Amino acid sequence: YVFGVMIINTNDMSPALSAGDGVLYYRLRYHINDVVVYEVDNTLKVGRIAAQAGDEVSFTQEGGLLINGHPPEKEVPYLTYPHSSGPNFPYKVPTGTYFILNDYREERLDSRYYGALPINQIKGKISTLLRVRGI
Amino acid sequence: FQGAQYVFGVMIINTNDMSPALSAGDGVLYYRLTDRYHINDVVVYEVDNTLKVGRIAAQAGDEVSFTQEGGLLINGHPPEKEVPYLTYPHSSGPNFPYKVPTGTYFILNDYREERLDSRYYGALPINQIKGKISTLLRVRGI
Amino acid sequence: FQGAQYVFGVMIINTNDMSPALSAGDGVLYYRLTDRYHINDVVVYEVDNTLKVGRIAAQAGDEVSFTQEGGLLINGHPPEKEVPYLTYPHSSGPNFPYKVPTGTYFILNDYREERLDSRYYGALPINQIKGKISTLLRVRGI
Amino acid sequence: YVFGVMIINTNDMSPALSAGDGVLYYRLRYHINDVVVYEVDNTLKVGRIAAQAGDEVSFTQEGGLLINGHPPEKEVPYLTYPHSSGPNFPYKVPTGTYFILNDYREERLDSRYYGALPINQIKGKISTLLRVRGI
Amino acid sequence: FQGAQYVFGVMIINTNDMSPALSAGDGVLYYRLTDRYHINDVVVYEVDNTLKVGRIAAQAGDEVSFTQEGGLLINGHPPEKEVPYLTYPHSSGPNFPYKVPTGTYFILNDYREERLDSRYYGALPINQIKGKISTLLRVRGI
Amino acid sequence: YVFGVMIINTNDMSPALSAGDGVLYYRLRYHINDVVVYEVDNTLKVGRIAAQAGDEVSFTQEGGLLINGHPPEKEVPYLTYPHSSGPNFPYKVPTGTYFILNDYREERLDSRYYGALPINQIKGKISTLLRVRGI
Amino acid sequence: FQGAQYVFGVMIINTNDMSPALSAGDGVLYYRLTDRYHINDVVVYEVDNTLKVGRIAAQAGDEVSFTQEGGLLINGHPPEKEVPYLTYPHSSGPNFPYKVPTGTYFILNDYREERLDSRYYGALPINQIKGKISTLLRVRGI
Amino acid sequence: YVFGVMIINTNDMSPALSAGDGVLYYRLRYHINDVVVYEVDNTLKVGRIAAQAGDEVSFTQEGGLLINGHPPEKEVPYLTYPHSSGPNFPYKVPTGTYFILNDYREERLDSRYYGALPINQIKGKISTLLRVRGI
C-alpha cells in the first residue's frame, strides 16, 4: 500500500547497507531480522529488529547479545556492548515495541540508547536495495 | 571478426564468495571497459569456461605477499579494502611473493576463506575480464 | 563452480551480416534462456572465441538443403523468414543435405551473401548460444 | 545458488501467470502457495503447491478443495473437480512429494492426474515475473 | 513552456483495484503516447490531483450501459476483456446509457467491486492520461 | 524542442521500420533520406524523403527512380512504379514541399499518389527506433 | 487514494534553460524521494500545469539576494555552483532579499538569462517537485 | 564497426564532458566540432576538432581563435591563448591531421602544444555520453 524511498545516509547498517544506497520501504507487524526505517527526534534512521514484545535482551561480558538467553540468528563482525546512558539490562521489550540494533554495532545509538521503538515511530520494512557505487 | 560487443551485462550472483559486498541472488550490472580496470573494482571474469566474480587487489608490476598472521600485502603495504576475514595462500597456488605480470589483475574473493581466486590461478589476463560490476539490486535477505 | 550467470546482455552490433533486420551500431538486448531456443530467433553466439549474431533457421533433427536457384530448404520446405538475398553453400562447409544434430541450432546470416554462418561451421551446440535478441535501439541511419 | 529462466507457455497458471510471461526460478523444501517449475514426461510445467507430506486432499460435490478438511489459503475463480484417470481421493500426500494444482483449475493435468510430484522432479520456486505484453 | 516531457515512468502499484492483472507492490513501466490510446490498454491517469490506474473499456463516441445481471455493454455488445467480477454502476455517477465524449476514455477497474472509476467520474480526457502500462515486474506474492 | 512518440502501425516503411516499432520524432528543414512522420486526411503516416524543392522526379520503364536523372542514394529491395491516380511525371517538386516515398514501394500511397507534402503537414524527423518484438 | 506512485521517470529535455549542464534533446532519468531534496540537485518540477527543470539554489530558512554586479547570494555567501552567466532578478518577481519559506526550494535556471524560475515564481513547495535528475544520456550535439 | 568505451578522467572537455562521464566512441574522416578520443604518449585524451587539413589557425591578442581568419562555430566560456612551447602560429594544418582543442581552454595541452594530431593517433568519434553523477 504505502511505499517510501530514501538514500541511506549513514553506515550504521554496514555492510548490509551503506551510505548512498537507495532503498524502498513499505508500511506493514514486523519480524526479527527485518531491516526498518524509523524515526527518533524528527530524524529517519535504519536498523534491524533484534527482539519483539516480551523478549528479554541481555549482554555477555564478551560483547555478545542474548535474546531470552539464546543469541540471535543474524551475526555481525562486531561485538555488542551496551550504551551507558541507555536503559538497564536485562531489558524487557514492551508490548507494541521492537528492539532495534545497528548491524555496525560500534554505533551504539540504537535501542541500546533509546529502548525499544514504538510501532508509530517505525516507518516501514526495507524490501529493496539499489547500490550504485562503492561496490 | 566480431558480430557484437558487450556494453553491459545484467547477471545474478550464484556464490557467496564475494560476501558481504555481494550475496547469492543479488542482481548486478556490469559495464565493459576497453581500457584498464582499477584496484578495488569488483569484476566479472572467466577462468576454465567458468564465470566468476572477484575484487581486483593488485595490478601489473605490483608485488603480492602474505604475513604469518593472515594479512595481505600489496607492495609491502596493506590494502585499502578491509574484509572481516583473514587471508592465507592456497597451498597449490603459485609462489609468493608474487610479481603481477604485465596485462593482468590479481583478483581476490572478499570472502577470503574461499581461496579459488588469484591465490590459486595467479593474476588474470585482461582479456578474461568481462567487465566491472557497477550496480547492485538486492530484494531478499537484506 | 559459477560465480554469476547472465540474465540479459546489452550489446552493440559490429557487423551488417544480420542486415537489414540489424545494422552496425544498433544497440540490442538479449536474454538468456535455460531451456531451448526457437526457429526465427536472432541469437548471440560464440564460435572460435568470437561473438557472432545470426538467426536460427533449423533445429535438432531438421534437414537443411539448397536448390540450384539459391533457395534454402528446411525439411524440404522453404522457411518462414524471407530475406532480399539468395542462399548458396559455403564451398568449404559440411555436406548437404545436412542433418541437424541433437542439441544444436542451424544459424544463418540474414544477409546471406556473407556465408560464415552454419553453412561454414555447421549447427551450433546450445551451450555456445549466449541468448536471444529481443530488443533493438537504433539512433542513426534509420 | 542455481537459477533458471523460462517463458511461460501455457495459461495453466492464469491469471497469476500468463503465456509469454518471463520467470526466474531457483532450486530450493517448498511451502504451500509456492509456485514451482516441475517436470513430467520430459516437459516443463508450472503449478502452485496446495499440499505437502502427510496432508490429505479431498473434494466437495460443489467443486471445492479440502486439505485436511479445511479449504486452502489461496482462492481462485474456478471450481476444482478431480480428474477421472487420476488417483483416488481422498488422497494422502507421500513423503518427499508435493501436491501441485493449476490456478486455472479447468486444466486438470496437475497432481489431480499425476499425483504428488517428487522433489527430484521439481526444478525450483518462481521468485520473479516479468510480463511484457497483454497487461 | 515545457522543460521536459515523459517518455516512460516506472512506478509501484499502491492499490488492488486492478487486480488480478496488477497487484499492490507490482512494479510497472508506462510509456507516454502523443497520439491516441486503445481499448484494453491499462493506463495511468490523474483525477483530483490523484494518480490512478485502470483499463480503457470504451472510447470517443462509444455508448456504455449495464444489464440488470451486472454485465457491461459497450455499444450494446459485451467487451473483450473478462474479469472475475460483476459490474454495477456507481449510484452517484453520471447517467447511463452514457455517450462517451470526444477526446475521452471510459476507464474501469478490473476489480469491478471498487467503483471509483469512470462509473463515478465519467470518461477521462486524454490530457489526464499519463501513459500506457506496458511492462510488469512482480517479485513477491506470485 | 518538440518531441512526439508513436507506434508504427503499418509496414509501409519495411524493413527500415515495422508495425509495432516505437519511434521518437522531433519537429525540425528536412534532408533527403530523413524518415518523417506526416499527416494526410487526419491520419499519421511515415515515409522517407526522396526529393526537395526544385528537384524533378521521374520513373524508368524498369521500375527505377530518378531524381534529376540520377537515381537515389538509398536503395530498397523493391521496384518503384507510379500510381495511376497520382500527379503526372516527370514531376517538379514545389517550394515548401518534400517528395516522400514508402521504403516498401509496393505500397504506392506516398507522394506518388499525393504529390509532395507541404511542410505544415510534416510532423517531424524520426530520430530513434525501439523494436521490442519480431526481430 | 493513490493507485500508483513514481519511482523513476525517464524524460526528454525540451529546453536549454538548464544549459550547459542539460541540453534540448537530452534524455534524463529522475528518481522520486519521499524525504527532502538538496542544494545543487537538478529537479523536475511543476508550476502552472507545466513541467520544468531547474537546480535547487536554496532551501527552507535560507535568504536569497543579488549584488548589483549580477551575483547571487545565499545567506550572504555566493553559492557552490558556478554558471557562465550573470544573475539578475525578474522585475515582476517577489521582493529580495527573499526568505525561503518552510517546505520550499528556491530553484534557478543554470542558463540564468532565462528568468522564469524562482526569481519569478518564488520558491517551489516540495509537493510540486517530481524528483531529482540523476542520470543523463546525450547522443547528438556533444 | 569498431566501438570503444571509456570513462572520461579529466575536465579538459568541460562542461561538454566531465570527469566520470561514460562515453562510446567509434573509429571513422572527421569533421569540425567532432569530439574525439586520441592518444599522445601512450595516454588517451579527448578533445574537439577545431580545424582540418589546409586550414590556418591564428590567435587574437584578446584570447580569440581564428580558423582562416574567421572564428569558429562552437563557442566556449573561455579565452584561447597559445602554449609557449607549442608550434608557431599562425599554424598551417598538415594533410592527414586534425587540430584539436580542449573546450576548457585554460588547459593548454591540446594541439596548441602538440600540433595537429595524425589520424593514426585518433581512436574515434564520441557518439554517446552517459553521465551518472554531478548533474
DSSP string, C106-132: EEE-SSTT---SHHHH-SEEGGGEEEE
Cα three-residue angle C28-C33-C37, rounded to 5 degrees: 85
Question: Is F94 strand, coil or helix?
Answer: coil
Looking at the partner chain, which of H1, H24, H127 has a beta carbon nearest the beta carbon of C14? H1
One-letter amino acid at C7 equals V
Which residues touch C90 (CB under 8 Å, ≥6 apart)? C115, C116, C119, C120
Contact of C27 with chain H, judged by CB distance below 8 Å, is answered with no
Cα three-residue angle B92-B95-B99, rounded to 5 degrees: 135
Which residues touch F18 (CB under 8 Å, ≥6 apart)? F8, F11, F131, F134
Contact of C57 with chain F, judged by CB distance below 8 Å, is answered with no
The total of structural domains in chain D comes to 1
Instruction: Return the beta strands (E) in chain D as ranges.
Output: 3-7, 22-26, 35-40, 43-51, 56-59, 65-67, 91-92, 97-101, 117-118, 122-131
Q: Which three cell numbers stand for residue C90?
A: 559455403
CA distance B131 to B43: 6
CB atoms closer than 10 angstroms to residue H65: 21
CA distance C105 to C119: 12
CA distance H1 to F98: 32
Contact C/H (≥3 CB pairs under 8 Å): yes
Query: How close is the nearest chain H Cα to the Cα of B6, in Å?
Result: 10
Which residues touch E16 (CB under 8 Å, ≥6 apart)? E23, E24, E111
Task: Give yes or no for a contact between A71 and A53, defined as CB atoms under 8 angstroms apart.
Answer: no
Backbone angles phi, psi at G131, to 5 degrees: 170, -175
Cα three-residue angle C77-C78-C82, rounded to 5 degrees: 165
| DSSP element (H, E) containing F123 | strand F122-131
Task: Give yes or no for a contact between H110 and H81, defined as CB atoms under 8 angstroms apart.
Answer: no
**Secondary structure string (H, E, C) spanning chain H:** CCEEEEECCCCCCCCCCCCCCEEEEECCCCCCCCEEEEEECCEEEEEEEEECCCCEEEECCCCCEEECCCCCCCCCCCCCCCCCCCCCCCEECCCCEEEEECCCCCCCCCHHHHCCEEHHHEEEEEEEEEECCCC
Encode burial over A31-46: b for 16+ CB neighbours within 10 A, e otherwise: ebebbbbbeeeeebbb
One-letter amino acid at G80 equals E
Name the residue among C64, C88, C96, C68 with its Cα closest to residue C77. C64
Contact C139 F127 (CB under 8 A): yes
Cα three-residue angle G45-G51-G56, rounded to 5 degrees: 30
Looking at the partner chain, which of E21, E133, E138 has a beta carbon nearest the beta carbon of D129? E138
CA distance D32 to D49: 5
CA distance H101 to H93: 13
Contact C14 H2 (CB under 8 A): yes
Backbone angles phi, psi at B119, to 5 degrees: -65, -20
Instruction: Find the CATH number of the domain harbouring B93.
Output: 2.10.109.10
Query: How close is the nearest chain C Cα to the Cα of B76, in Å?
Result: 30
Encode burial over B31-47: b for 16+ CB neighbours within 10 A, e otherwise: bbbeeebebebbbbbeb
Looking at the partner chain, which of B84, B135, B139 has a beta carbon nearest the beta carbon of A131? B135
Looking from the CA of A103 toward its CB, the CA atoms found within 13 Å total 23
Instruction: Return the beta strands (E) in chain A as ranges.
Output: 3-7, 22-26, 35-40, 43-51, 56-59, 65-67, 91-92, 97-101, 117-118, 122-131
Q: Which three cell numbers stand for residue C127?
A: 551451450
Task: Give yes or no for a contact between H44 and H123, defined as CB atoms under 8 angstroms apart.
Answer: yes
Contact of A44 with chain G, judged by CB distance below 8 Å, is answered with yes
Query: How close is the nearest chain B Cα to the Cα of H26, in Å?
Result: 12
The full length of chain F comes to 135
**Taking CB atoms and an 8 Å cutoff, what residues of chain F touch E35?**
6, 44
Method: X-ray
CA distance to A62, B18, H66, per residue, from H88 (Å): 75, 56, 14
Domain that holds residue G126: 1-142
Residue with cell 519480524: A31
CA distance C49 to C65: 28
Q: Which three cell numbers stand for residue D101?
A: 494444482
- F vs G, Cβ pairs < 8 A, gives 9
Looking from the CA of A52 toward its CB, the CA atoms found within 13 Å total 7
**Taking CB atoms and an 8 Å cutoff, what residues of chain B touch C18?**
3
CA distance to B90, H29, H98, per residue, from H119 (Å): 48, 8, 7
Given its phi and psi angles, is residue D113 left (phi above 0), alpha (psi -120 to 50 degrees) or beta?
Answer: alpha
Task: Give yes or no for a contact between D68 and D54, defined as CB atoms under 8 angstroms apart.
Answer: no
**Taking CB atoms and an 8 Å cutoff, what residues of chain C touch F15?**
20-21
Q: Which three cell numbers stand for residue G108?
A: 534557478
Nearest-Cα residue of chain E relative to residue G109: E3
Contact of B25 with chain C, judged by CB distance below 8 Å, is answered with no
Peptide bond into A82 cis (omega under 30): no
Contact of D3 with chain B, judged by CB distance below 8 Å, is answered with yes
Torsion sign (Cα): H129, H130, H133, H135? positive
Which residues touch B75 (CB under 8 Å, ≥6 apart)? B58, B62, B63
Contact E3 G44 (CB under 8 A): yes
Max Cα distance, chain F (Å)? 44
CA distance to C43, C56, C103, per residue, from C36 (Å): 12, 12, 9
Residue with cell 597449490: B92
**Secondary structure string (H, E, C) spanning E30-82:** EECCCCCCCCCCEEEEECCCCEEEEEEEEECCCEEEECCCCCEEECCECCCCC
CA distance D129 to G117: 43
Peptide bond into B20 cis (omega under 30): yes
CA distance H3 to B2: 11
Which residues touch A28 (CB under 8 Å, ≥6 apart)? A122, A124, A125
Q: Which three cell numbers stand for residue G85?
A: 552567466
Contact A135 B137 (CB under 8 A): no
Looking at the partner chain, which of D17, D127, D131 has a beta carbon nearest the beta carbon of E135? D131
Name the residue among A52, A61, A60 with its Cα closest to residue A101. A52
Question: Is C100 strand, coil or helix?
Answer: coil
One-letter amino acid at B36 equals R
CA distance D5 to D27: 12
Looking from the CA of F48 toward its CB, the CA atoms found within 13 Å total 21
CA distance C121 to C105: 11
Encode burial over F56-78: b for 16+ CB neighbours within 10 A, e otherwise: ebebeeeeebbbeeeebeeebee
**Taking CB atoms and an 8 Å cutoff, what residues of chain A touch B138?**
128-129, 131
**Taking CB atoms and an 8 Å cutoff, what residues of chain G touch F28?**
none
Q: Which three cell numbers stand for residue D34?
A: 509456492
CA distance B140 to B134: 20
Looking at the partner chain, which of A1, A24, A127 has a beta carbon nearest the beta carbon of E14? A1
Encode burial over G108-131: b for 16+ CB neighbours within 10 A, e otherwise: bbbbbebbbbbbebbbbebeebbb
Name the residue among B91, B85, B87, B90 with its Cα closest to residue B74. B87
Q: Å resolution of this model?
A: 2.2
Residue F63, beta-bridge partner list: none
Give the strand order in the sheet containing F65-67: F65-67, F56-59, F91-92
**Taking CB atoms and an 8 Å cutoff, what residues of chain E touch G53?**
3-4
Task: Give yes or no for a contact between G77 and G85, defined as CB atoms under 8 angstroms apart.
Answer: no
Residue D35, beta-bridge partner list: D48
Backbone angles phi, psi at D113, to 5 degrees: -100, -40
Chain centroid to Cα G33, Å, comes to: 16
CA distance E17 to E107: 12
Question: Is B22 strand, coil or helix?
Answer: coil
DSSP D127: E
The full length of chain B comes to 142
Task: Give yes or no for a contact between B25 and B137, defined as CB atoms under 8 angstroms apart.
Answer: no
Contact of C20 with chain F, judged by CB distance below 8 Å, is answered with yes
Name the residue among E95, E85, E88, E86 with its Cα closest to residue E122. E95
Residue with cell 602538440: H114
Contact of C136 with chain F, judged by CB distance below 8 Å, is answered with yes
CA distance E3 to G124: 15
